[PDB]
Amino acid sequence: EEFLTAEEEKAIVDAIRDAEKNTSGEIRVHLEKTSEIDVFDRAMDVFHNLKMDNTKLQNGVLIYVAVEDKTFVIYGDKGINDVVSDDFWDTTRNAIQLQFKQGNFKQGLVDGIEKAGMALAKYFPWKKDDIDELPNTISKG
């Protein structure tokens, strides 16, 4: 609950809104204290439980963070995985890690969100009648 201040949370939600003007992809952040040994499986469960599969193009992506460990997973839906190459999320991960290793938690998420919108834009361009399919709220567990 104290992971982020209200001002930091506002900056993150504003970064999602800006990223979603560059792509039809949908982005959410989920924060929790501790993860499971298989972090990918935990992020997949959270993605499901947040109903992030409810996008026309199956292009939702969850940035899952385990705050006590400062570890994270970028989990994209099937629409993304069917078209992108193996290095797709590298710039997003690097942008988050660069800031997390310096203790800049808010900035890591903002920078990752911005990078993710630009990466998704390559395969999922924003369209005039875009729908905001998933809430931009930070999910807390």
- Annotated binding-site positions: 20, 26, 130-132, 134, 136
CB atoms within 10 A of CB 112: 30
Among 33, 36, 132, 140, binds Ca ion (CB under 5 A): 132
Dihedral over alpha carbons 8, 89, 23, 124 (to 10 degrees): -160
CB atoms within 10 A of CB 67: 16
Q: Compute the least distance from the CB of residue 24 to Ca ion, in Å.
A: 6
Q: Would you say 9 or 20 has its CB closer to Ca ion? A: 20
Range in contact with Ca ion (rule: CB under 5 A) among 33-41, 60-68, 82-90, 130-138: 130-138
Q: Compute the least distance from the CB of residue 86 to Ca ion, in Å.
A: 26
Strands 60-66 and 26-32: parallel
Task: List binders of Ca ion among 5-64 (CB under 5 A).
Answer: 20, 26
Any contact of residue 77 with Ca ion (CB under 5 A)?
Answer: no
| Strand partners of residue 32 | 66
Q: Compute the least distance from the CB of residue 37 to Ca ion, in Å.
A: 30
Alpha-carbon distance values, 17 to 23, 25, 134 (Å):
10, 11, 11
Q: Which residues contact Ca ion by CB under 5 A?
A: 20, 26, 130, 132, 134, 136
